[PDB]
């Protein structure tokens, strides 16, 4: 029923940070630039346009700010901006020196559809080094009440909130340059109070190192406040009597850079981006210490004044001004991925090391199939042993054939290798149980499969008892998610699971990383390389199910939200980025029908079927910021629930193709 | 004047330590802590910050609620306190402690034979892999005092520790998640006059989490014109569900001063000389810092100030600081090119 | 003049504590059960129907409470039950996890005749032993103002009172499970402020002796507060991953049990009872120290928001859902009489 292709309908809000052409001392001209940039924002369906500090006057005009004609010109340019915004869709936030009581205030006028919503004075006026703001301007910290603008008294002060009434996840707070540089920023309290989108208007003359400073503090604010941060600085046109301007603009969301514009531009620039208000909602919803902090400053936070406006955003397809990656567990940026891998690996190793220290260095029993997972776990187990000064021959690896890679790796590593043929025991069990296969019937059902799976595990566990060892778990996060494993006796069961927290899509990249580090050597490298090259299509592509895993595990997003995201990430193979190690051939695209089909399978398997196998999970380290699936940790759920509501949301909300 | 004395030039030698945790065994944690504090003492350091719940192990879950665990924590604490009589640095050591109805996630500040104060963690994460509110009480809003082996020492989140013989050294302590909330305890402490912010962390390691620690510890220090001293738990913490990297780091006004190896084998210390005069000078010049204090006057004037005397070394103990030859010309090539 | 045979005209108010069938993670199914039980309360001429904690979602679902589709479905089911209450007599009190500001709260939604009257957050969230509530849910104590439920700002908080303008002896306070277990329960203060009927929605997984703990505290609450105490625990349908559920319901009045239902029922159960509002009026009129305690906690008892609604209860003969002893001075129970 929703327009599935509408970003507004998926909880996005389009925000724009703008740097305009300053004509200092000339508000009619600054207004005219602002208006032209506002119309481009409207055209883009943006709900917010933040301009630089003192937009209407020029930031750098010094005592020209005290000139009657300057002040008067400003006021008339504003009233004209307001009249024009009648037919503009975005909330406009626009700097202006304004008269109130005894002084001029460095203010931000929040404008929307033909009416001022509020005027926000700069709380904090730098009067040091190259800044002289206390000379011409009065602090706004702790002023309240109203201000008369064009025949209307409108909220004036630093405790204002602009809550969109048709967009409950968009609640705007405004501050101004130095406001965000002090230990206790205005916007920190406003996030506790309920602001989701934090605007900052800057003049910010540019200096060596200062752009890093802007970034450090706008980014960490967005992270610590679980907010978007929208930041605009002055550029061309400001006075160069003592200073220069770079016109930097940027948008942050929860510590991530959504957009940024060119530094030192010829001409005006914008950062436009889609902010995910559900990501912010979900993060707040889960970090209760955020609410604990609000209740600690209840007086501060409850004092805020909330101004409403109907945003009435466009209903149609307007694209997604957002970078949605194909692999939420696998960053496309190669130095970021190198970092994840370093960390994944060391997490797995140190987790297991502690298990081994704690048990006075047991032997290490591991089933090696030549697959990616067991291959990787062997490597992890080898490094653990090295670091602890234990002989590699204390790793007891077992090939367990049922009805080359493993053996080569085992020998290259120098671990104790052995083959145990489970065939005769499988045969005897299938007969004892009266399975049709024991009388010739080619019935290859779950029992047939499980009898083997189970016996592998049964054997390893008995070896472990007999030989003073522990069985290493091999199953990865994606398997835990789907219940693609054999419960209890089999697969799912071990003394310690190193891959438990690692999703399937990340596994190959870990091996790549192991080869690259080169620490094991030429032959080991070669065998590992070989394992990658030699190496379930009814649970779907793991690339799709890991995409779904991240949205549910981190954010709890509804299914139609996940389809939207996956479709945007995976729809066109030629668009967006791929991590290292995907040859052009190895680069699939997925249709909406494909994405929808496998998501139906995900919700059913994840929410309903698989919890019970997750519920009795061996020990192992959590790996990913995306979460892990331990029932003692990240994922607490019933083993006895239907996924009806998720499947119903897909029927109603996600188009069939 | 001793020209070659870092202390006489307004420096304070600060240390962030990651010890070897023996979970559920306080006496052994105190042994690892005491060993590392003597190393710090030898280095002429004035502060040693250890990880969250140092004396118990952070990761022991309901073992925290076991009586023998708490008795042993207290006996170990009292012995640590006894041993510092001879130790130059102020020790900041985590412990689960009984006060009133519950146990608190505390940092105990220890100097020269006495406890100076006890600081409860303010915000207790109870989400994802964190379960802290199950065993432990929030420290936010708590004041008054606490009985530690025959003395009533200050207890609460509003404490400053000032070196009467070294005024640029003013210490505030917060614990792990305390630095991740919109309005950290430590932001208010800086306005009240804290120049050195300690953070004891447990902080199970996850992909990306060091970047997060970094961002908030660096941005804290820059926003608050302070040194920020961070110490996380490492080897020995339970790996039932989690992994530990024992990261320690020292920031100053946005700059990184020192940091230690991640996932070390064995104990590690970051040690660095903090320029209290740097901090002093930035504070002096940035008036809007003090404007912010005055806006939160009642918040910032209520802090309690505990005095101690450091009596630091008079002599030449080198300088644990990278002083660039060209303040105007970064030696780092990437940075120089950016400049 | 008066219809002599009308319990309402004699200052009685009919109340139901209900235990419904849970379908964990399925609010439309929970709502259909609720609506059906509410229709039976209406047919009984009940003024009030209390359902178990988190009625709409299921109490036992843990992190599923944090799912957008869980919360959205909860909201939609809730709106339909409010639309369906247009034709129902009783105030319904149904549990639901609802978003407010940063988090979800464990709430009771007080519903009457096509509108929501108020939304009461659980005050104290057990985070110990088998309970994990602070992980998913925010505490409700100290929270005021309002919440937007389907295009309407309705009172929100632990300071709320639902007073019948046409039945002045019926003044309702709602609290949730653990709220009655703490040294200073929210219902205690609400009694001093005027509440005469105290509702408790519970999840309360069952354990050896726990029904005895519920009784101890519901009973003594009703006696110490000179009030009716209406209590519903969760039942069949709830997750048995780690817990079991007994579906216990009970109605107390000044220390005396009015009604209680079968434990571990197969199917839905109710306690329905006529509460004597004049009996409560009478005990309060006479025990001045009750009012002395109110004036001692004057600031605390005077800030409750009173929310009015008209009941229009039935005027005719609907019998009397109450034990009336032939000999008030001679208890018909042998063990009780022997003691007397
Ligand atoms: N909620 C619940 N609570 C308690 N018990 C529950 C239950 N739901 C099912 N069960 C029981 O558990 C059993 C079903 O679970 P399980 O024994 O795992 O059996 P099941 O999950 O039905 O099948 C396992 C399948 O996963 C695939 N697999 C397994 C292992 C390795 C690989 C590989 O590619 O390497 C693939 C393979 O296709 C295999 O047949 C049944 O006995 C069922 O009655
Ligand atoms: C506009 C502004 O306040 C920038 C000055 C700030 N303190 C800085 O960049 O250091
Ligand atoms: C404690 C700390 O500084 C980092 C880890 C923290 N618990 C988190 O990232 O949530
Ligand atoms: C009503 C409830 O939250 C369970 C009972 C309570 N936790 C208790 O203390 O028994």
């Amino acid at each position: 029923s929703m327009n599935f292709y509408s970003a507004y309908q998926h909880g996005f809000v389009r925000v724009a940070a703008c740097t305009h052409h300053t004509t200092i001392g000339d508000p009619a001209a600054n207004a005219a630039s602002v208006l032209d940039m506002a119309r481009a924002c409207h055209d883009d369906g943006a709900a917010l346009a933040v301009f630089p500090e003192l937009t209407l006057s020029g930031y750098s005009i010094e005592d020209v700010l005290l000139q009657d004609s300057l002040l008067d010109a400003v006021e008339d340019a504003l009233l004209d901006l307001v009249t024009e915004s009648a037919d503009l869709l975005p909330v406009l936030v626009v700097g202006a020196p304004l008269r109130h009581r005894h002084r001029i205030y460095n203010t931000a006028v929040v404008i929307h559809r033909g009416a001022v919503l509020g005027v926000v004075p700069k709380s904090y006026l730098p009067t040091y080094r190259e800044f002289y703001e206390r000379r011409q301007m009065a602090p706004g910290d702790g002023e309240r009440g109203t201000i008369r603008i064009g025949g209307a008294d409108v909220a004036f002060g630093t405790d204002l909130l602009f809550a969109a009434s048709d967009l409950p996840g968009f609640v705007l707070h405004v501050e101004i340059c130095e406001d965000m540089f002090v230990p206790m920023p205005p916007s920190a309290e406003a996030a506790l109070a309920g602001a989701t989108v934090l605007a900052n208007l800057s003049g910010s003359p540019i200096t060596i190192g200062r752009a890093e400073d802007r970034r450090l503090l706008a980014r960490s604010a967005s992270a610590r406040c679980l907010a978007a941060y929208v930041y605009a600085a002055a550029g061309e046109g400001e006075s160069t009597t003592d200073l220069a301007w770079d016109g930097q603009t940027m948008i942050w969301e929860n510590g991530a850079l959504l957009a940024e514009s060119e530094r030192f531009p010829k001409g005006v620039r914008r950062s436009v981006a889609d902010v995910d208000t559900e990501l912010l909602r979900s993060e707040r919803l889960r970090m209760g210490t955020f609410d604990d902090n609000r209740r600690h400053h209840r007086e501060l936070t409850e004092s805020f004044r909330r101004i409403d406006f109907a945003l009435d955003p466009p209903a149609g397809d307007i694209g997604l001004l957002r970078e949605v990656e194909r692999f939420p567990f696998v960053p496309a940026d190669p130095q970021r991925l190198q970092q994840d891998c370093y960390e994944a690996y060391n997490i797995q190793v140190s987790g297991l090391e502690q298990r081994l220290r704690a048990l006075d260095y047991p032997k290490v029993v591991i089933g090696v199939s030549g697959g990616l997972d067991s291959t990787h776990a062997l490597i992890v187990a080898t490094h653990a042993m090295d670091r602890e000064g234990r002989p590699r021959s204390d790793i007891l690896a077992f090939a367990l054939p049922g009805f080359n890679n493993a053996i080569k790796l085992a020998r290259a590593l120098g671990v104790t290798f052995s083959e145990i043929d489970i065939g005769d025991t499988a045969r005897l069990m299938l007969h004892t149980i009266g399975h049709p296969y024991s009388v010739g019937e080619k019935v290859y059902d779950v029992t047939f499969e499980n009898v083997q799976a189970g016996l592998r595990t049964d054997y390893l566990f008995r070896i472990a008892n007999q030989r003073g060892g522990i069985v290493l778990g091999t199953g990865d996060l994606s398997e835990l998610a789907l219940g693609w494993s054999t419960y209890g006796v089999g697969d799912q069961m071990s003394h310690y699971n190193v891959n438990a927290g690692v999703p399937k899509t990340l596994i190959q990249h870990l091996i790549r990383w192991v080869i690259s580090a080169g620490e094991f050597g030429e032959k080991v490298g070669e065998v590992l390389q070989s394992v990658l090259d030699t190496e379930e299509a009814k649970v779907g592509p793991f690339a799709l199910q890991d995409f779904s895993l991240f949205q549910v595990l981190r954010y709890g997003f509804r299914p139609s939200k996940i389809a939207f995201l996956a479709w945007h990430a995976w729809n066109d193979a030629e668009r967006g980025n791929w991590p290292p190690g995907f040859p052009k051939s190895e680069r699939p695209s997925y249709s909406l029908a494909e994405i929808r089909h496998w998501l139906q399978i995900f919700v059913q398997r994840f929410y309903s079927f698989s919890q019970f196998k997750r519920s009795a999970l061996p020990n192992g380290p959590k790996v990913s910021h995306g979460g892990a699936l331990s029932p003692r940790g990240d994922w607490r759920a019933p083993s006895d629930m239907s996924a009806r509501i998720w499947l119903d949301q897909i029927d109603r909300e996600v188009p069939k193709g």
Side-chain angles (χ1 to χ4, degrees), chain A residues 14 37-39 41-43 45-49 85 87-93 111-113 311:
Chain A
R14 194 153 292 175
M37 293 184 85
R39 289 174 164 151
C41 285
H42 170 90
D43 279 344
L48 176 68
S85 91
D87 309 62
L88 266 20
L89 164 67
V91 178
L92 313 168
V93 177
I111 296 144
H112 172 253
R113 293 272 184 209
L311 197 239

PDB file of all heavy atoms in Angstrom, chain A residues 14 37-39 41-43 45-49 85 87-93 111-113 311:
ATOM      1  N   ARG A  14      15.408  14.069   4.056  1.00  0.00           N
ATOM      2  CA  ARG A  14      16.413  14.694   3.201  1.00  0.00           C
ATOM      3  C   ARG A  14      16.910  16.031   3.771  1.00  0.00           C
ATOM      4  O   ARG A  14      16.150  16.997   3.880  1.00  0.00           O
ATOM      5  CB  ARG A  14      15.884  14.865   1.751  1.00  0.00           C
ATOM      6  CG  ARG A  14      17.014  15.185   0.759  1.00  0.00           C
ATOM      7  CD  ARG A  14      16.719  14.740  -0.659  1.00  0.00           C
ATOM      8  NE  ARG A  14      16.687  13.288  -0.813  1.00  0.00           N
ATOM      9  CZ  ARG A  14      16.353  12.661  -1.930  1.00  0.00           C
ATOM     10  NH1 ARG A  14      16.017  13.365  -3.004  1.00  0.00           N
ATOM     11  NH2 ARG A  14      16.358  11.327  -1.980  1.00  0.00           N
ATOM     12  N   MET A  37      19.469  28.977  -3.652  1.00  0.00           N
ATOM     13  CA  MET A  37      19.894  27.704  -3.095  1.00  0.00           C
ATOM     14  C   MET A  37      18.760  26.955  -2.397  1.00  0.00           C
ATOM     15  O   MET A  37      18.681  25.729  -2.494  1.00  0.00           O
ATOM     16  CB  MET A  37      21.056  27.901  -2.140  1.00  0.00           C
ATOM     17  CG  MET A  37      22.300  28.350  -2.843  1.00  0.00           C
ATOM     18  SD  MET A  37      23.613  28.421  -1.651  1.00  0.00           S
ATOM     19  CE  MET A  37      24.156  26.718  -1.677  1.00  0.00           C
ATOM     20  N   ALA A  38      17.887  27.680  -1.700  1.00  0.00           N
ATOM     21  CA  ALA A  38      16.629  27.115  -1.180  1.00  0.00           C
ATOM     22  C   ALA A  38      15.726  26.518  -2.262  1.00  0.00           C
ATOM     23  O   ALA A  38      15.021  25.560  -1.993  1.00  0.00           O
ATOM     24  CB  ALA A  38      15.836  28.163  -0.385  1.00  0.00           C
ATOM     25  N   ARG A  39      15.711  27.072  -3.464  1.00  0.00           N
ATOM     26  CA  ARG A  39      14.776  26.555  -4.479  1.00  0.00           C
ATOM     27  C   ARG A  39      15.302  25.238  -5.045  1.00  0.00           C
ATOM     28  O   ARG A  39      14.523  24.373  -5.504  1.00  0.00           O
ATOM     29  CB  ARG A  39      14.581  27.562  -5.607  1.00  0.00           C
ATOM     30  CG  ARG A  39      13.789  28.769  -5.201  1.00  0.00           C
ATOM     31  CD  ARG A  39      13.749  29.798  -6.302  1.00  0.00           C
ATOM     32  NE  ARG A  39      12.688  30.758  -6.037  1.00  0.00           N
ATOM     33  CZ  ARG A  39      12.688  32.029  -6.434  1.00  0.00           C
ATOM     34  NH1 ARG A  39      13.713  32.526  -7.120  1.00  0.00           N
ATOM     35  NH2 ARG A  39      11.657  32.813  -6.130  1.00  0.00           N
ATOM     36  N   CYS A  41      17.084  23.157  -3.197  1.00  0.00           N
ATOM     37  CA  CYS A  41      16.710  22.254  -2.121  1.00  0.00           C
ATOM     38  C   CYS A  41      15.284  21.770  -2.226  1.00  0.00           C
ATOM     39  O   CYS A  41      15.031  20.584  -2.073  1.00  0.00           O
ATOM     40  CB  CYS A  41      16.950  22.909  -0.792  1.00  0.00           C
ATOM     41  SG  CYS A  41      18.700  22.922  -0.476  1.00  0.00           S
ATOM     42  N   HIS A  42      14.362  22.686  -2.500  1.00  0.00           N
ATOM     43  CA  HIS A  42      12.988  22.334  -2.752  1.00  0.00           C
ATOM     44  C   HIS A  42      12.934  21.333  -3.893  1.00  0.00           C
ATOM     45  O   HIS A  42      12.241  20.317  -3.828  1.00  0.00           O
ATOM     46  CB  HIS A  42      12.218  23.573  -3.198  1.00  0.00           C
ATOM     47  CG  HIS A  42      10.848  23.276  -3.720  1.00  0.00           C
ATOM     48  ND1 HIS A  42       9.743  23.238  -2.905  1.00  0.00           N
ATOM     49  CD2 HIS A  42      10.405  22.994  -4.965  1.00  0.00           C
ATOM     50  CE1 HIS A  42       8.670  22.955  -3.628  1.00  0.00           C
ATOM     51  NE2 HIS A  42       9.046  22.799  -4.883  1.00  0.00           N
ATOM     52  N   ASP A  43      13.638  21.643  -4.966  1.00  0.00           N
ATOM     53  CA  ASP A  43      13.582  20.797  -6.133  1.00  0.00           C
ATOM     54  C   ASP A  43      14.022  19.364  -5.813  1.00  0.00           C
ATOM     55  O   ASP A  43      13.416  18.407  -6.288  1.00  0.00           O
ATOM     56  CB  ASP A  43      14.404  21.430  -7.241  1.00  0.00           C
ATOM     57  CG  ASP A  43      13.642  22.533  -7.964  1.00  0.00           C
ATOM     58  OD1 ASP A  43      12.390  22.630  -7.834  1.00  0.00           O
ATOM     59  OD2 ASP A  43      14.313  23.315  -8.663  1.00  0.00           O
ATOM     60  N   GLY A  45      13.536  17.831  -3.087  1.00  0.00           N
ATOM     61  CA  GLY A  45      12.712  17.326  -1.994  1.00  0.00           C
ATOM     62  C   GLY A  45      13.404  17.305  -0.610  1.00  0.00           C
ATOM     63  O   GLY A  45      13.132  16.423   0.207  1.00  0.00           O
ATOM     64  N   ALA A  46      14.276  18.272  -0.329  1.00  0.00           N
ATOM     65  CA  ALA A  46      14.943  18.332   0.984  1.00  0.00           C
ATOM     66  C   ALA A  46      14.019  18.983   2.013  1.00  0.00           C
ATOM     67  O   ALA A  46      13.326  19.930   1.681  1.00  0.00           O
ATOM     68  CB  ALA A  46      16.278  19.088   0.894  1.00  0.00           C
ATOM     69  N   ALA A  47      14.008  18.484   3.248  1.00  0.00           N
ATOM     70  CA  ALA A  47      13.192  19.048   4.341  1.00  0.00           C
ATOM     71  C   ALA A  47      13.937  20.066   5.207  1.00  0.00           C
ATOM     72  O   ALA A  47      13.365  20.634   6.129  1.00  0.00           O
ATOM     73  CB  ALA A  47      12.688  17.921   5.229  1.00  0.00           C
ATOM     74  N   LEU A  48      15.209  20.296   4.936  1.00  0.00           N
ATOM     75  CA  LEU A  48      15.991  21.155   5.766  1.00  0.00           C
ATOM     76  C   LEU A  48      17.078  21.785   4.892  1.00  0.00           C
ATOM     77  O   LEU A  48      17.641  21.117   4.047  1.00  0.00           O
ATOM     78  CB  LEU A  48      16.562  20.360   6.967  1.00  0.00           C
ATOM     79  CG  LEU A  48      17.519  21.072   7.928  1.00  0.00           C
ATOM     80  CD1 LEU A  48      16.814  22.178   8.771  1.00  0.00           C
ATOM     81  CD2 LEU A  48      18.213  20.107   8.849  1.00  0.00           C
ATOM     82  N   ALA A  49      17.332  23.077   5.071  1.00  0.00           N
ATOM     83  CA  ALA A  49      18.445  23.754   4.445  1.00  0.00           C
ATOM     84  C   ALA A  49      19.116  24.623   5.519  1.00  0.00           C
ATOM     85  O   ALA A  49      18.525  25.566   5.981  1.00  0.00           O
ATOM     86  CB  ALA A  49      17.969  24.604   3.295  1.00  0.00           C
ATOM     87  N   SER A  85       9.372  31.699   1.103  1.00  0.00           N
ATOM     88  CA  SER A  85       9.289  30.349   1.639  1.00  0.00           C
ATOM     89  C   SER A  85       7.851  29.806   1.684  1.00  0.00           C
ATOM     90  O   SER A  85       7.655  28.596   1.862  1.00  0.00           O
ATOM     91  CB  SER A  85       9.941  30.271   3.018  1.00  0.00           C
ATOM     92  OG  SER A  85       8.974  30.531   4.014  1.00  0.00           O
ATOM     93  N   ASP A  87       6.075  29.106  -0.706  1.00  0.00           N
ATOM     94  CA  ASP A  87       6.006  27.975  -1.633  1.00  0.00           C
ATOM     95  C   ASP A  87       7.267  27.132  -1.637  1.00  0.00           C
ATOM     96  O   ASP A  87       7.575  26.460  -2.596  1.00  0.00           O
ATOM     97  CB  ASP A  87       5.601  28.405  -3.042  1.00  0.00           C
ATOM     98  CG  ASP A  87       4.351  29.258  -3.049  1.00  0.00           C
ATOM     99  OD1 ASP A  87       4.400  30.357  -2.433  1.00  0.00           O
ATOM    100  OD2 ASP A  87       3.319  28.830  -3.662  1.00  0.00           O
ATOM    101  N   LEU A  88       7.997  27.127  -0.544  1.00  0.00           N
ATOM    102  CA  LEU A  88       9.116  26.220  -0.496  1.00  0.00           C
ATOM    103  C   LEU A  88       8.781  25.084   0.439  1.00  0.00           C
ATOM    104  O   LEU A  88       8.033  25.273   1.400  1.00  0.00           O
ATOM    105  CB  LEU A  88      10.407  26.970  -0.182  1.00  0.00           C
ATOM    106  CG  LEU A  88      11.213  27.394  -1.438  1.00  0.00           C
ATOM    107  CD1 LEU A  88      10.411  27.459  -2.782  1.00  0.00           C
ATOM    108  CD2 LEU A  88      11.947  28.687  -1.200  1.00  0.00           C
ATOM    109  N   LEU A  89       9.262  23.890   0.108  1.00  0.00           N
ATOM    110  CA  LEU A  89       9.072  22.717   0.949  1.00  0.00           C
ATOM    111  C   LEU A  89      10.056  22.653   2.189  1.00  0.00           C
ATOM    112  O   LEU A  89       9.628  22.307   3.290  1.00  0.00           O
ATOM    113  CB  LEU A  89       9.145  21.462   0.074  1.00  0.00           C
ATOM    114  CG  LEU A  89       9.337  20.050   0.644  1.00  0.00           C
ATOM    115  CD1 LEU A  89       8.138  19.533   1.473  1.00  0.00           C
ATOM    116  CD2 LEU A  89       9.744  19.062  -0.463  1.00  0.00           C
ATOM    117  N   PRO A  90      11.336  23.026   2.035  1.00  0.00           N
ATOM    118  CA  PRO A  90      12.234  22.874   3.235  1.00  0.00           C
ATOM    119  C   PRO A  90      12.132  23.904   4.354  1.00  0.00           C
ATOM    120  O   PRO A  90      12.105  25.111   4.164  1.00  0.00           O
ATOM    121  CB  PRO A  90      13.636  22.922   2.641  1.00  0.00           C
ATOM    122  CG  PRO A  90      13.493  23.631   1.377  1.00  0.00           C
ATOM    123  CD  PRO A  90      12.065  23.543   0.872  1.00  0.00           C
ATOM    124  N   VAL A  91      12.116  23.411   5.564  1.00  0.00           N
ATOM    125  CA  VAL A  91      12.514  24.248   6.689  1.00  0.00           C
ATOM    126  C   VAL A  91      13.844  24.916   6.305  1.00  0.00           C
ATOM    127  O   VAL A  91      14.749  24.225   5.911  1.00  0.00           O
ATOM    128  CB  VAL A  91      12.592  23.416   7.965  1.00  0.00           C
ATOM    129  CG1 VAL A  91      13.062  24.268   9.146  1.00  0.00           C
ATOM    130  CG2 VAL A  91      11.218  22.834   8.252  1.00  0.00           C
ATOM    131  N   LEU A  92      13.896  26.260   6.325  1.00  0.00           N
ATOM    132  CA  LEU A  92      15.137  27.037   6.123  1.00  0.00           C
ATOM    133  C   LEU A  92      15.693  27.540   7.446  1.00  0.00           C
ATOM    134  O   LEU A  92      14.955  28.060   8.298  1.00  0.00           O
ATOM    135  CB  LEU A  92      14.914  28.234   5.197  1.00  0.00           C
ATOM    136  CG  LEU A  92      14.144  27.966   3.882  1.00  0.00           C
ATOM    137  CD1 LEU A  92      13.726  29.267   3.194  1.00  0.00           C
ATOM    138  CD2 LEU A  92      14.892  27.006   2.952  1.00  0.00           C
ATOM    139  N   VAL A  93      16.991  27.383   7.631  1.00  0.00           N
ATOM    140  CA  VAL A  93      17.673  27.887   8.842  1.00  0.00           C
ATOM    141  C   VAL A  93      18.780  28.837   8.374  1.00  0.00           C
ATOM    142  O   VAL A  93      19.674  28.428   7.642  1.00  0.00           O
ATOM    143  CB  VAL A  93      18.226  26.752   9.668  1.00  0.00           C
ATOM    144  CG1 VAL A  93      19.034  27.281  10.953  1.00  0.00           C
ATOM    145  CG2 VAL A  93      17.127  25.809  10.070  1.00  0.00           C
ATOM    146  N   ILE A 111      12.846  29.111   9.454  1.00  0.00           N
ATOM    147  CA  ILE A 111      11.706  29.581   8.596  1.00  0.00           C
ATOM    148  C   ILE A 111      11.072  28.392   7.933  1.00  0.00           C
ATOM    149  O   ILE A 111      11.783  27.421   7.645  1.00  0.00           O
ATOM    150  CB  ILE A 111      12.202  30.516   7.460  1.00  0.00           C
ATOM    151  CG1 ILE A 111      12.809  31.782   8.036  1.00  0.00           C
ATOM    152  CG2 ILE A 111      11.108  30.826   6.401  1.00  0.00           C
ATOM    153  CD1 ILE A 111      13.978  32.271   7.266  1.00  0.00           C
ATOM    154  N   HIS A 112       9.757  28.444   7.702  1.00  0.00           N
ATOM    155  CA  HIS A 112       9.082  27.352   7.064  1.00  0.00           C
ATOM    156  C   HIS A 112       7.715  27.726   6.465  1.00  0.00           C
ATOM    157  O   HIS A 112       6.840  28.171   7.162  1.00  0.00           O
ATOM    158  CB  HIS A 112       8.931  26.144   8.021  1.00  0.00           C
ATOM    159  CG  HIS A 112       8.064  25.041   7.461  1.00  0.00           C
ATOM    160  ND1 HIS A 112       6.789  24.784   7.923  1.00  0.00           N
ATOM    161  CD2 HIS A 112       8.283  24.159   6.449  1.00  0.00           C
ATOM    162  CE1 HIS A 112       6.277  23.768   7.243  1.00  0.00           C
ATOM    163  NE2 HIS A 112       7.157  23.382   6.333  1.00  0.00           N
ATOM    164  N   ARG A 113       7.521  27.490   5.185  1.00  0.00           N
ATOM    165  CA  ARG A 113       6.207  27.772   4.555  1.00  0.00           C
ATOM    166  C   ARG A 113       5.539  29.077   5.024  1.00  0.00           C
ATOM    167  O   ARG A 113       4.416  29.053   5.491  1.00  0.00           O
ATOM    168  CB  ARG A 113       5.240  26.582   4.734  1.00  0.00           C
ATOM    169  CG  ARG A 113       5.625  25.295   3.974  1.00  0.00           C
ATOM    170  CD  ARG A 113       5.051  25.298   2.558  1.00  0.00           C
ATOM    171  NE  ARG A 113       5.324  24.032   1.853  1.00  0.00           N
ATOM    172  CZ  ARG A 113       5.460  23.904   0.525  1.00  0.00           C
ATOM    173  NH1 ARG A 113       5.356  24.978  -0.263  1.00  0.00           N
ATOM    174  NH2 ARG A 113       5.714  22.701  -0.030  1.00  0.00           N
ATOM    175  N   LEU A 311       5.424  19.092   7.796  1.00  0.00           N
ATOM    176  CA  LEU A 311       6.427  19.071   6.731  1.00  0.00           C
ATOM    177  C   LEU A 311       5.830  18.808   5.376  1.00  0.00           C
ATOM    178  O   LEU A 311       6.271  19.404   4.401  1.00  0.00           O
ATOM    179  CB  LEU A 311       7.540  18.054   7.014  1.00  0.00           C
ATOM    180  CG  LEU A 311       8.890  18.116   6.273  1.00  0.00           C
ATOM    181  CD1 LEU A 311       9.192  16.871   5.519  1.00  0.00           C
ATOM    182  CD2 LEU A 311       9.133  19.347   5.425  1.00  0.00           C
TER     183      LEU A 311
END
